[PDB]
Structure 1
Amino acid sequence: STPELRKTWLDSMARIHVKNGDLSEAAMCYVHVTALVAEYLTRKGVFRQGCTAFRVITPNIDEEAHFNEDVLMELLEQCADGLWKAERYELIADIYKLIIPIYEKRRDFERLAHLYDTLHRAYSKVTEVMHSGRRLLGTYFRVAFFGQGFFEDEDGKEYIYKEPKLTPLSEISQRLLKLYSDKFGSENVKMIQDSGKVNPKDLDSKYAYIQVTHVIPFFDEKELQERKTEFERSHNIRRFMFEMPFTQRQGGVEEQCKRRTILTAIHCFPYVKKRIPVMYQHHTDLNPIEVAIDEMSKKVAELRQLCSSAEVDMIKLQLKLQGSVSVQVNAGPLAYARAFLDDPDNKVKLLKEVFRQFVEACGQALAVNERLIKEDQLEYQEEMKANYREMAKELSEIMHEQL
């Protein structure tokens, strides 16, 4: 049977993922197997759901378009435990809801006790990690291969790679060298460290090229509203984003543009594989002032979120604030005001507004920090306080208003 083949394939894929420690991909394998058995059993009138109660756990289930109740029950418990190991706690109830009525009908109170013990722990973990930020579900990367000579059918193909925990650009890079150098000889593998859409029309046909770009999950305004939690923004994700500096590479503020590329994968993560082909992509260019505006916005919200907190972080507050007003190495937020807020485009009602919100933020930041310094700083806070006020005059100056 094809359901039996598919199963076999998914179950070995799972042991591989388990071996590699890629638990969410293992979990997805369990779910796909389970959804397959459920669908079949539903057609036979033994089960009541199939595929679609699993569509909530993963949209990829749609791809699955001997077996009995007892098998189903054992697979469901397998998915539940799978999801626990992936640390995808929020999802366990979706599985157990399917097996609860079966246990009730069988009067299996011991099983019910266990499942509800797991759900209690799971929802307990959820509040923990929502607060401790110790759940690390993965980092994502655009990887592209170039060189018919060594990659063949792989030449030109782009994937999203999903990597463990906090895997840095630097680390996945190396790993793909050591991987493809041990396969295509050392001096034959080259790495493209540039994020631009590259044309083979200038690659040495002698080498295998690998391009690796860090990307993050992308959502539009509607999606950001459906997905309120960080977990919802880390589960069932299909679109990824990166931004690229360009000039009409990296220049001065007056001329700094930005390209935002949105990549759409053919399936969502998590999936039964840890890499997924890119289906489609497009981009959006930003002017230097749009850039300014956008950059400024991110900083004020950054500060506010730091200020308006209970578990306030003194170090992370100074770091952000010092790098806000006591700027030593880089240009300084004033560079935006000098190059953009002098005497164009009436959308500046944004650029100014943000500068209004910016000062208010550093102030509140100073204010907050005033109440954290163990005196040994104190002077440090004064220079900052001094710089804040100083620049505050500069902005007020050019904008012809108070600060």
Structure 2
Amino acid sequence: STPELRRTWLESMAKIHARNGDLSEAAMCYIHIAALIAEYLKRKGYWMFSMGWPAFLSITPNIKEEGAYNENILVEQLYMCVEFLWKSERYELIADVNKPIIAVFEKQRDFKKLSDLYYDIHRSYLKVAEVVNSEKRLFGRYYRVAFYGQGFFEEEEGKEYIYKEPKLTGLSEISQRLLKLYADKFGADNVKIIQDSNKVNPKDLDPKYAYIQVTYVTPFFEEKEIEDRKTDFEMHHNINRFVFETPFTLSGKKVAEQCKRRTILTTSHLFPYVKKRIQVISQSSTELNPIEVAIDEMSKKVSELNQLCTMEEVDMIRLQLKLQGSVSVKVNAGPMAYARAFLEETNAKKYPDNQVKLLKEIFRQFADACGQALDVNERLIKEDQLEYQEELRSHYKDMLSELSTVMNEQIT
């Protein structure tokens, strides 16, 4: 995209991203633009201080994507970048970008500026300690969209994309938004939401109508990465793969016949990037039968209750609900439908053991904490709500009894 032209793209893309709340990406735009000139000035040999364009691969791997004007321009661009991060609630990466700034001030020896350069790095980490893990910061809700239609869409005639919508834009917003944006450019009626979630491709669409698959997705990681991605920021910084659990239940949809499919898709360039959209490329699916998901989804509501107790706040409203979901089931199956189908003596003879054994330890830990939960709900009930909690432990104590009959085993 030549040196002279690929630069002008980033600038007006920054002020444009700046203009309409695409902060993080406009921020990313400047530190990604500033690497581009780092190599061009390396390519004329004008001189990690002054090491081509990989010194900005520290903050993001897609900084490489810019390689295929003077010094104070290189520092005016990071200076403009760092502030864009300061508004984009991403206080962290500002440390990894003031390095080459310092690496030149230490070369020209200024001290006062290096002083208040090292101050604003402290003025960031401090604001982090009251932001990080307070769930105050939020970007979130990346979506998985795909266009399908030949003789309709030009450049994006089919590719599968991944939008980063902002704040708490739910699907009611983005779906109505894409529908509306494209319904009135090819006539009403003929603009099908095509809510599918399944890896559609058969194109049994009667090509007189145009489709637009949409399906929420979540930054997906493994077991070893989950120790690394502890807080709320670290999971949004540089994400390869997002996963969405898609039900493929036998026949239609909705204990023993209900199954779901995790389909992960990567994103080529890593979020956050310059342009808001970026494509998927592959949807590898790990299918989970009605016992593997039972193990994993009944395990899901276990760690969650345990996560409202280590919290310091613990809000009287947010607890009583999730335990009603745990102890006092109404207008839903119930946590015991898992026991009778995959744990009764007559059942659980063809399902392998150790599977059912892990289902035991999850079941107990889900109990011993469930009881820890009702005690906390006794600490902030106050007044009338006490007559209620008297019923909660009742439903819970009975839940222990039935668990003991299906399992042929004593439950304390």
- TM-score normalised per structure 1: 0.95
Q: Cα deviation per residue 1:344-369 (whole Å; 9 max; x = unaligned)?
A: 32110011221111111210001111
Q: Which runs of 5+ in 2 are unaligned?
A: 346-350
- Partner of 1:328 in structure 2? 330
Contact 2:53 2:63 in 1 (8 A): yes
CA distance in 1, matches of 2:254, 2:358: 21
- Alignment-mate amino acid for residue 124 of structure 1: L
- Partner of 1:340 in structure 2? 342
- Partner of 1:401 in structure 2? 410
- Partner of 1:277 in structure 2? 279
How far the C-alpha of 1:105 sits from its partner, in A, is 4.0
How far the C-alpha of 1:141 sits from its partner, in A, is 0.8
1:236 to 238, 263, 267: 238
- Partner of 2:395 in structure 1? 387
Q: Cα deviation per residue 1:11-50 (whole Å; 9 max; x = unaligned)?
A: 1111221122101111121011111112233442436223
SS of 2:281's partner is: strand
How far the C-alpha of 1:138 sits from its partner, in A, is 2.6
SS of 2:130's partner is: helix
Contact 1:236 1:268 in 2 (8 A): yes
How far the C-alpha of 1:264 sits from its partner, in A, is 1.1
- Identity, in percent, stands at 69
- Partner of 1:27 in structure 2? 27
Compared CA separation, residues 139 and 252, structure 1 to 2 (3 A) = closer
Q: Which runs of 5+ in 1 are unaligned?
A: none
- Partner of 2:228 in structure 1? 226
CA distance in 2, matches of 1:3, 1:37: 8
- Alignment-mate amino acid for residue 398 of structure 2: E
CA distance in 2, matches of 1:226, 1:355: 27
Contact 1:148 1:154 in 2 (8 A): no
SS of 2:183's partner is: helix
Matches within 5 A, 1:192-271: 192-248=194-250, 251=253, 253-271=255-273
Matches within 5 A, 1:143-222: 143-222=145-224
CA distance in 2, matches of 1:379, 1:250: 42
SS of 1:345's partner is: coil
Between structures 1 and 2, the one with greater strand share:
1
- Partner of 1:15 in structure 2? 15
Matches within 5 A, 1:15-164: 15-43=15-43, 44-46=45-47, 48-65=50-67, 67-164=69-166
CA distance in 1, matches of 2:221, 2:267: 13
- Partner of 1:373 in structure 2? 381
- Alignment-mate amino acid for residue 410 of structure 2: E
Matches within 5 A, 1:310-325: 310-325=312-327
Compared CA separation, residues 183 and 252, structure 1 to 2 (3 A) = closer
CA distance in 1, matches of 2:357, 2:202: 44
How far the C-alpha of 1:108 sits from its partner, in A, is 3.5
- TM-score normalised per structure 2: 0.93
CA distance in 2, matches of 1:392, 1:275: 50
SS of 2:334's partner is: coil
Q: Which range is displaced more, 112-121 or 198-207?
A: 112-121
- Alignment-mate amino acid for residue 33 of structure 1: I
CA distance in 1, matches of 2:210, 2:119: 52
Q: Cα deviation per residue 1:104-150 (whole Å; 9 max; x = unaligned)?
A: 44444443344334322321222222143111123111101112132
Q: Cα deviation per residue 1:277-300 (whole Å; 9 max; x = unaligned)?
A: 112221010011111111111111
Q: Which range is displaced more, 323-332 or 247-256?
A: 247-256
CA RMSD across the alignment: 1.8
- Alignment-mate amino acid for residue 123 of structure 1: Y
- Alignment-mate amino acid for residue 379 of structure 2: R
1:351 to 359, 369, 385: 359
Compared CA separation, residues 323 and 315, structure 1 to 2 (3 A) = same
Contact 2:133 2:232 in 1 (8 A): no
CA distance in 1, matches of 2:204, 2:254: 28
CA distance in 2, matches of 1:137, 1:247: 32
CA distance in 1, matches of 2:250, 2:289: 10
Compared CA separation, residues 249 and 141, structure 1 to 2 (3 A) = farther
CA distance in 2, matches of 1:109, 1:182: 59
Q: Which range is displaced more, 133-142 or 113-122?
A: 113-122
SS of 1:274's partner is: coil
SS of 1:295's partner is: helix
CA distance in 2, matches of 1:283, 1:266: 18
CA distance in 2, matches of 1:77, 1:348: 57
CA distance in 1, matches of 2:52, 2:127: 29
SS of 1:183's partner is: coil
Q: Which range is displaced more, 370-379 or 35-44?
A: 35-44
Q: Which range is displaced more, 331-340 or 134-143?
A: 134-143
- Partner of 2:348 in structure 1? none
CA distance in 2, matches of 1:389, 1:199: 50
Compared CA separation, residues 249 and 267, structure 1 to 2 (3 A) = farther
Compared CA separation, residues 377 and 250, structure 1 to 2 (3 A) = farther
Contact 1:149 1:206 in 2 (8 A): no
- Alignment-mate amino acid for residue 260 of structure 2: K
Contact 1:149 1:208 in 2 (8 A): no
Instruction: Tell me the number of residue pairs that the alignment of Structure 1 and Structure 2 aligns.
Output: 402
SS of 1:50's partner is: coil
How far the C-alpha of 1:303 sits from its partner, in A, is 0.8
